[PDB]
Symmetry: C2
Subunit: 574 residues, 2 copies
Amino acid sequence: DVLSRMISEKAALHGLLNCLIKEFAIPEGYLRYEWPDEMKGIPPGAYFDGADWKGIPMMIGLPDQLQLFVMVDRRDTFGSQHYLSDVYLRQAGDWQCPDFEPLVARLLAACEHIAGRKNPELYEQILQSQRLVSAIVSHNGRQRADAPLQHYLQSEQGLWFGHPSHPAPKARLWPAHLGQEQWAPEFQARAALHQFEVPVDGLHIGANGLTPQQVLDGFADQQPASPGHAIICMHPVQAQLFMQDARVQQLLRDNVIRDLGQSGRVASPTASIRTWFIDDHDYFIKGSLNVRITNCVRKNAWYELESTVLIDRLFRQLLDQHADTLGGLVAAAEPGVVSWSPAAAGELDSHWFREQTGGILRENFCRRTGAERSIMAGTLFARGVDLQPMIQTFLRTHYGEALDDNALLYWFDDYQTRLLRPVLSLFFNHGVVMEPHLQNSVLVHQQGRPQQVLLRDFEGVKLTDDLGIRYIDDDIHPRVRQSLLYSREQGWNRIMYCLFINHLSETILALSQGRPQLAPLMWRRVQQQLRAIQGELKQPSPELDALIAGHPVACKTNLKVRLAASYVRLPSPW
Amino acid sequence: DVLSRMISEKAALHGLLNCLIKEFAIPEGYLRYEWPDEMKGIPPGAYFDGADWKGIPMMIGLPDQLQLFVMVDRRDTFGSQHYLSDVYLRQGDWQCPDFEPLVARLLAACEHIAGRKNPELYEQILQSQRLVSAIVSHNGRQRADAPLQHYLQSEQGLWFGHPSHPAPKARLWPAHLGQEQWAPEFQARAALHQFEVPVDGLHIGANGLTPQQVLDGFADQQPASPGHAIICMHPVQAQLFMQDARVQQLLRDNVIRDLGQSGRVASPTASIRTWFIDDHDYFIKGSLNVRITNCVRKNAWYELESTVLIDRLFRQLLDQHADTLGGLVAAAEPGVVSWSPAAAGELDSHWFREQTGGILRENFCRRTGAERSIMAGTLFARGVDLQPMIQTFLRTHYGEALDDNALLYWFDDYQTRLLRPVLSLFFNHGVVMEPHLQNSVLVHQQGRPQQVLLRDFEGVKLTDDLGIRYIDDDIHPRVRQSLLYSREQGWNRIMYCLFINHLSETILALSQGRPQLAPLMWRRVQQQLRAIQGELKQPSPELDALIAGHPVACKTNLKVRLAAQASYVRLPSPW
């Protein structure tokens, strides 16, 4: 219990450190890889192991004269490195190692002095998130540390720390009465989904390769529905918020709709919380949840429910008709969408009801791939309850021995090509902007060897205004079209961050933990892969040229955006 | 250079901690294996690695209202363990102090227990640490297990010295003579100092050599004028010798001549006053009237005579009773020389013999092999990376990472080759060896233990109930007196040298990173003692006591220096 608290604080601190390094120190030039002139306050065991220095010193000198010291295993331009000591703070006095909360307080105040703007809400989110990770580790600390990597659902239920470059990755504002553990994947939550009986004249159903009834069937068994009615499902927390609304109370009172309780399919929430998994079912069920997670209430709007159908259609056409220009793309289909609103509702009431009741079927790819062969990428490259990258033991078990350098380099090569070739082919050949971050990527493997990196989530897919746009029919509603369109520039900036900083930085760090020498080798292979992709490309790709040539890389901010700034630039690995 | 200093400061402190734990904490019961209730002051990374604790908490409650905290890899009755954190002090919240103040505070607590201060020890601790820094600075770039690859390198590779001594590298001669020119750790070489002396004043012991051959062993005698010979000594010893008005007077009157550093160029070995020459048949061992790690490293006249007698005895026991000697391998010491003026009279002649005393030890490396012979203290010491050099040494030789059983098997071979000869000597013949790490040399064949060669006769004793038989009637009373030990006196010293000085460090170095091996190694020692007992040709009730778990005698290194009884404590048995 003390151990779990100490594990959770170390993880939280490393999360915040990552943010400070990427979003401020590196781009503003506050970082130096040097020893302080005076070390008074730092014990020798912090930076010295009896033989040599514990890696490399890192100095961060902030404009309010707070200095931070930590030992790191490498110099990395993207600010990806393992922290080899406790963090030491010195103000304009001696070095101290404060407790978790006093340190977070001091560090945040420094960032606020840079940004100009203070944020007291964020400080409590950071503390709450750490407290939640503590209970997570305490709950899960009995099992093998690499158990999240053995089963697909376990990988969705095994992202103990969340986004590893985020100030408060487990911040969640649940409705007042609930508590954090109840609907948390990290506590292996299961629940029967909530159901409503609703009249079919209020239904809006998008279907690709399915009939509207097959889509309904996918969300809920329709047997309880009376004639003229269908059954729809909802997150049980969402259902309770839904029913707090007087419009819903009225409909219930007039028997227009019917509350069927938690009588839906028993499902398990995935890492994204509002998407549910069922083992022997053909679909994931993604519903609306009006809960603020990582400081954001993400709703699926009506126009987002509309563009899902269009994007699913697009991907099916591209997979069928344009395979030679998709770089081996493998993506999960989203062939069904449902929402409900009263037939005679006005526009604004109709938009509200459809946002509340919105539901999306995603292809359950496990049925094809096997649960023991599919791992969500974020968990794959995450740390276990012992704070070690889980992938190291996962790989050793599969290969039959402790992987040497050569085997890790080979594995990285097979992984990265299967991520980069599909994503960059979609973007440059077709103007399709994927969101290939760790949560939206799934490794399919054979005895540990990468086979596919399956891509997920049409919700964030965009189409470029100079190319991807042509897949939108002139007949589509303007708000849906606006919802889809990015500029080429917007697309590439997002791709830059997602592919290299969000995704492959974490992959390389996780693989190279005790072997920092491997990082530049792995990045050098990325550079060469990008060259090979560029020759493979059909349409022109000057952005790819610039990347290859060493142009600085766009980095999305997670802390700096909260003190506002949404992007910074990080120097290239080559 | 900052690196080298921090290495030396870590090694020094650990040595100091070894003394505190062995001499005060364990015997007096001030040591507990448990966590402090309040740990404000100790940073998480000192005791928590990210997953679980860094070994086991060690707390020491010092009667002066002080508390020590350190993480350790094992509980050990003999106070042998690897320290896995920095040391924290509480007096107030926990503190990690810099080397100098930290040493001051540990020493004051020990001075409190003893009730006596020793500020000269304190300065000596610092001086030792500062030399160790220069040493690691000088040698810190080589391969860490280099010292175990060759005999001379092994003598020159004891960077940190005695591991359970507060100031192991403090060599206290006049500073203007230098340190590094005499330091084995700097691969020092030097011509021995020589004097021309009249033959009428020589005192020469010789077994199986002529007196002339003995003289030749020390120095080329062709430069000697008629009626004279050449004797050699440590250049430092020569400078100290010539301070004395008696030596000044002989020089003045031309009774003797200062020949300067004109002698054989040789290399000091780890003991400082014994010199090595690869292509010569003998080590040269001189008197050094200087205090190095507790003792003054000179030999009195009766000890010069003792050496001769012991060497002669070993020749006789090998000639007749070899199969009662447990497979003994011993470096012969067949030549001893000293000088004093023929007309001096006893007090002056004893003084002169002490100063000019020299001993020839057979250069065994020549029968055993340079790449095959390793001084034991170095074998089980730490390299410049503060890791036990033996680990990579064994891995290199065994062509693979040694599994537990392989480590146990190696230990079993080593341990038997050390115990069998020493115990057979003690119990069959009343002969008390001094088998500590520096008097012990492993001869190995591709890492496999073949023999543990034993050396140094100056400390060898004979028991008053058995060893006495080998003392002839014609032998001077003072020589007889110096050799004689009670049976109990002899067993107590052997206990320390074998189990606490030697095998405890053998096991600790071997079981680094695998503390669960230590009790298994100690069990093997108990079994080997039972086996050796069966082979013994005389009663051995002391071995029954030991095997049954009797507390073990322990020579002190810090306590004896704070004391004006205090030379030994007792530690519990590891079985």
